[PDB]
Design a protein around this ligand. Structure first.
Ligand SMILES: *[C@@H]1O[C@H](CO[C@@H]2O[C@@H](C)[C@@H](O)[C@@H](O)[C@@H]2O)[C@@H](O[C@@H]2O[C@H](CO)[C@@H](O[C@@H]3O[C@H](CO)[C@@H](O)[C@H](O)[C@@H]3O)[C@H](O)[C@H]2NC(C)=O)[C@H](O)[C@H]1NC(C)=O
Ligand SMILES: *[C@@H]1O[C@H](CO[C@@H]2O[C@@H](C)[C@@H](O)[C@@H](O)[C@@H]2O)[C@@H](O[C@@H]2O[C@H](CO)[C@@H](O)[C@H](O)[C@H]2NC(C)=O)[C@H](O)[C@H]1NC(C)=O
Ligand SMILES: C[C@H](N[C@H](C(=O)O)[C@@H]1CCCN1C(=O)[C@@H](N)CC(=O)O)C(=O)N1CCC[C@H]1C(=O)O
Ligand SMILES: *[C@@H]1O[C@H](CO)[C@@H](O[C@@H]2O[C@H](CO)[C@@H](O)[C@H](O)[C@H]2NC(C)=O)[C@H](O)[C@H]1NC(C)=O
Ligand SMILES: [Cl-]
Ligand SMILES: [Mg+2]
Ligand SMILES: [Zn+2]
Length: 605
């Protein structure tokens, strides 16, 4: 490590720690920028040489983290928790946690190489015919094909291509990750990830939330299963068993809005999926990002700066470069460069993803003048919820009319049921998946799920919570968890379950501050400068204050609460329950062993 980046001498008291924090800040912005820049160069141009440069940058960051981390522990480990400055407590507490920098050099190199190799496998995997990429090709098949055998070829091809080669690497990564965080005092990596929420009852609190939400999912599931039975027939759909995992609009069956046209309760009404109108009007990626920006500025939040428009990658490159297409938002930690990297497609659900990512950017812009260690959300679920909250307003039929995407307007009970069902496919179907992913990964980190049970335990949880089954036979050579982006790319997932509950708490609070008095699911906060100021206060805080206290200021309650989500969906919750009773459905999947047969002549077709 360059000596100019190493710590000097500081006194072992609060006066010394303030100077330590300022000196750390000056050098950390340099080390972080070089690491993010190297990752950007690789993720927008996957090559062996850019992987080498990114691993070199990662190794330098580990030397930096070790040097300042060991000094922080030597000087302040017994006293930082009693400092009077709460920002300083958070800075020192962060720096004393070394993570992968606890590993010796050879294991640091092995760790960084595994991250690079796992990333490459996921983002370059293809499905070749008798070759398709995940984005756009396989994504488009799962979203719009209604041929059972074509969907199966895409689902099986993807899970085999991405999952099978990842397994040996993921075993090695798990062991090294645990060895690293054990030296920071954590029993395993999952315990470190959960510690970010600073709640001793986290896992029990989540389980209680899911108990309140499960009946809504069970009723949506039975209603959609019935619609699938009418389309695909008794051979491929069991009305008392799990749904085949490739038939729900999405490679992971994680949200179902793309089969809305199969299940719409009142099909004679206006089409609430505005994708065809976007294409007819000639929308492109740039228009989608500018329309999202203008919602933020209508609230008197910040526009995107020039560096964002000059630096971002908003379409898949046409020179055939290999890129990581999975949409992501980037803070370069220099208070100037902020970017989105998205292989944008012109669809309604991509318009929502644009809002999701720009929500991350807006957070970065609002907290950029804090110390670098505090440039994060009050907790990770807060960061995920910002853009989704704006997207709840944008999706309303009234707002869509304002921006020219929905001509006919009506306010009757059937139109309300259509809208709420469409939103339930997006939000309620996701809840079991958002909950189960880190239940699986926490058990892997703890050793309760060893390599010999990776797929057995994944499919136990998928069936238990989502009520789906694999449409072809699987065994432990398959590694179907690895075919989901966040697993090989080592990004935690429980943030998304927290967000899908939290965003309805935020929506209720901002709608009240805006002076809106109608039904919650018809609120639009567009042009409410009062709502903007209440959101701005949260964003500018970073991680400087306990999230429970920030939440109480914002919504009046200091805990996650499912009641705003239930209140939003109340009308369709009742309607779905009545429909299923009238049709004599079984709620659940008591034939838990059932799997569908193979199509005739599969895969020749
Ligand atoms: C659409 O129409 C509803 C009312 O009609 C209901 O919803 C339709 C979609 C149909 O399903 C009807 O069969 C159904 O009865 C409008 O909602 C109503 O808005 C008014 C005005 O905001 C609400 O009155 C307010 O109530 C609060 C106290 O709760 C007072 O403080 C206010 O002063 C004001 O009186 C009313 O409660 C609300 N009704 C319901 C059932 O929530 C809705 O505004 C309308 N949508 C549009 C876009 O026009
Ligand atoms: C794990 O599965 C693969 C293939 O997947 C399926 O396995 C069975 C469930 C079968 O009913 C079919 O669904 C698939 O074959 C096995 O590897 C293949 O095995 C077949 C013979 O069954 C052989 O012809 C192929 O060459 C094998 N390789 C492939 C398809 O790539 C594998 O043996 C199973 N067991 C283990 C421990 O991996
Ligand atoms: C499409 C979205 N991509 C993630 C996200 O935006 O959260 C990407 C990749 C993982 C982290 N990330 C970032 O951009 C971070 N750098 C942001 C930050 O932490 O500051 C995604 O994965 N989503 C959206 C809802 C459901 C879930 C899914 O699709 O499974
Ligand atoms: C993608 O990354 C590669 C590096 O892996 C870039 O290729 C280098 O380009 C410079 C000048 O453009 C040459 O001097 C180097 O010799 C190249 N390296 C290799 C290994 O070929 C390439 O420019 C990048 N592409 C884009 C579009 O940014
Ligand atoms: Cl998280
Ligand atoms: Mg979708
Ligand atoms: Zn996100």
């Amino acid at each position: 490590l360059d000596p100019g980046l190493q710590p000097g001498q500081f006194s072992a008291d609060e006066a010394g720690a303030q100077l330590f924090a300022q000196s750390y800040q000056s050098s950390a912005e340099q080390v972080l920028f070089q690491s993010v820049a190297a990752s950007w160069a690789h993720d927008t141009n996957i090559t062996a040489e850019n992987a080498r440069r990114q691993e070199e940058a990662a190794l330098l960051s580990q030397e930096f983290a070790e040097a300042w981390g060991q000094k922080a522990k030597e000087l302040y480990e017994p006293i930082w928790q009693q400092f009077t400055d709460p920002q300083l407590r958070r800075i020192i507490g962060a720096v004393r946690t070394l993570g992968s920098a606890n590993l010796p050099l050879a294991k640091r190199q092995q760790y960084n190489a595994l991250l690079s190799q796992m990333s490459r496998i996921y983002s370059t995997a293809k499905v070749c015919l008798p070759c398709w990429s995940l984005d756009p090709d396989l994504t488009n098949i799962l979203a719009s094909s209604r041929s059972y055998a074509m969907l199966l070829f895409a689902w099986e091809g993807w899970h085999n291509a991405a999952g099978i080669p990842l397994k040996p690497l993921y075993e090695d990564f798990t062991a090294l990750s645990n060895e690293a965080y054990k030296q920071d005092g954590f029993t395993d990596t999952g315990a470190y990830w959960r510690s970010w929420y600073n709640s001793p009852t986290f896992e029990d609190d989540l389980e209680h939330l899911y108990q309140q939400l499960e009946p809504l999912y069970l009723n949506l599931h039975a209603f959609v299963r019935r619609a699938l039975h009418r389309r695909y027939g008794d051979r491929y759909i069991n009305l008392r068993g799990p749904i085949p995992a490739h038939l729900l609009g999405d490679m992971w069956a994680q949200s179902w809005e793309n089969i809305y046209d199969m299940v719409v309760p009142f099909p004679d009404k206006p089409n609430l999926d505005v994708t065809s109108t976007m294409l007819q009007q000639g929308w492109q990626a740039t228009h989608m990002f500018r329309v999202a920006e203008e919602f933020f500025t209508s609230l008197e939040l910040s526009p995107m700066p020039p560096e964002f428009w000059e630096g971002s990658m908003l379409e898949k490159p046409a020179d055939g470069r290999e890129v990581v297409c999975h949409a992501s938002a980037w803070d370069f930690y220099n208070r100037k460069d902020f970017r989105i990297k998205q292989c944008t497609r012109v669809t309604m659900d991509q318009l929502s993803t644009v809002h999701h990512e720009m929500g991350h950017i807006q957070y970065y812009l609002q907290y950029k003048d804090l110390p670098v260690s505090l440039r994060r959300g009050a907790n990770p679920g807060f960061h995920e919820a910002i853009g989704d909250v704006l997207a709840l307003s944008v999706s309303t039929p009234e707002h869509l009319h304002k921006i020219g995407l929905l001509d006919r307007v009506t306010n009757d009970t059937e139109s309300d049921i259509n809208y709420l069902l469409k939103m339930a496919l997006e939000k309620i179907a996701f809840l079991p998946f958002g909950y189960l992913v880190d239940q699986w990964r926490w058990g892997v980190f703890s050793g309760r799920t060893p390599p010999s049970r990776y797929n057995f335990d994944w499919w136990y949880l998928r069936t238990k919570y989502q009520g789906i089954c694999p449409p072809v036979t699987r065994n432990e050579t398959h590694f179907d968890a690895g075919a989901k982006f966040h697993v090989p790319n080592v990004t935690p997932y429980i943030r998304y379950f927290v967000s899908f509950v939290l965003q309805f708490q935020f929506h209720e609070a901002l709608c009240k501050e805006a002076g809106y008095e109608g039904p919650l699911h018809q609120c639009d906060i567009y042009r409410s400068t009062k709502a903007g100021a209440k959101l701005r206060k949260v964003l500018r805080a970073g991680s400087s204050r306990p999230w429970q206290e920030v939440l109480k200021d914002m919504v009046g309650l200091d805990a996650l609460d499912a009641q705003p989500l239930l209140k939003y969906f109340q009308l369709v919750t009742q309607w779905l329950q009545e429909q299923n009773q009238q049709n004599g459905e079984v709620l659940g999947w008591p034939e838990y062993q059932w799997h569908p047969p193979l199509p005739d002549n599969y895969p020749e077709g």
